[PDB]
Amino acid sequence: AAMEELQKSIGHKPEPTDEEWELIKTVTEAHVATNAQGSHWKQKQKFLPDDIGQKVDLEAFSHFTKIITPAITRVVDFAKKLPMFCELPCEDQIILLKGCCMEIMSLRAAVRYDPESETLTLNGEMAVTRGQLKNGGLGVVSDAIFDLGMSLSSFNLDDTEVALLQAVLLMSSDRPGLACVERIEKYQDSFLLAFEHYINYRKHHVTHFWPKLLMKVTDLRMIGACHASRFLHMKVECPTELFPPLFLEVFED
Ligand SMILES: O=C(O)Cc1cc(I)c(Oc2ccc(O)c(I)c2)c(I)c1
Numbered sequence: 001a002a003m004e005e006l007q008k009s010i011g012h013k014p015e016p017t018d019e020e021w022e023l024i025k026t027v028t029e030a031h032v033a034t035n036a037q038g039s040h041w042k043q044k045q046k047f048l049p050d051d052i053g054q055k056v057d058l059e060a061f062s063h064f065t066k067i068i069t070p071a072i073t074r075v076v077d078f079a080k081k082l083p084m085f086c087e088l089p090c091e092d093q094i095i096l097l098k099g100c101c102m103e104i105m106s107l108r109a110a111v112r113y114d115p116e117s118e119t120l121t122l123n124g125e126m127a128v129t130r131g132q133l134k135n136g137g138l139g140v141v142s143d144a145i146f147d148l149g150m151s152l153s154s155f156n157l158d159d160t161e162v163a164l165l166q167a168v169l170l171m172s173s174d175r176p177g178l179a180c181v182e183r184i185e186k187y188q189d190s191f192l193l194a195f196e197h198y199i200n201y202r203k204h205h206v207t208h209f210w211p212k213l214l215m216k217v218t219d220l221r222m223i224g225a226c227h228a229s230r231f232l233h234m235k236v237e238c239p240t241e242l243f244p245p246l247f248l249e250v251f252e253d
């Protein structure tokens with residue numbers, strides 16, 4: 001219990017326990033496996049026509065929702081590759097995924113922010129600008145993600161960190177309706193821990209790194225909630241036909 005609480009008070013910044021490494025291995029695997037087209041510096045993006053997205057620019061909105069079912073599936077793939085997840089009742093596995101889906105999606109899109117072209121890359125293919133994503137039906141949610149991506153520039157995260165982060169967003173035991181609420185906090189904490197340890201081991205040269213990286217979990221949660229509201233404004237504004245099936249089931253909450 002306090003082998004940590006004490007080891008801390010001393011000043012020791014504990015690396016990950018042999019077992020935690022196994023857990024980190026699992027999560028970094030599952031992430032990279034359910035990821036985009038790879039992930040590197042210098043060319044790949046398919047810059048979205050500049051005349052797209054400039055109410056709701058239905059032209060853009062289409063492009064997005066077009067490649068939205070793939071993204072939503074990779075999130076479910078990731079969650080599938082985490083044993084702890086599988087250990088949960090199908091009911092809960094659905095409440096969890098529907099909750100953290102946009103959160104993990106905003107994260108992935110945010111960590112693909114290119115400061116040069118000032119664009120994110122959705123599904124690792126389509127590049128979009130702030131106003132393109134904004135006018136394509138996300139509104140102020142675009143500024144949220146773009147502002148995040150810019151901020152995450154400095155944390156210079158890696159797959160494992162972005163992989164763990166997603167696991168923390170996933171085991172949010174506060175989702176309404178959860179049945180096995182305890183067994184979920186146990187797993188999230190298990191993660192937050194292997195996560196904190198991994199950050200010590202990596203030792204970034206940023207003061208208060210961890211406290212700052214947890215403040216991101218909150219911002220991601222806020223992008224999530226803000227999206228739910230934007231989904232309403234989208235239902236009413238855009239048609240009822242341009243809404244992929246999966247996309248729809250996942251977001252009626
Ligand atoms: O990049 C990835 O893998 C994940 C990802 C994929 C997409 I498409 C995306 O844009 C959205 C999401 C919801 C929505 O209602 C609309 I309109 C656009 C974002 I932000 C992130």
Ligand SMILES: [As]
Pocket residue numbers: 226227229230
């Ligand atoms: As909002």
Ligand SMILES: [As]
Pocket residue numbers: 140144226
């Ligand atoms: As906001």
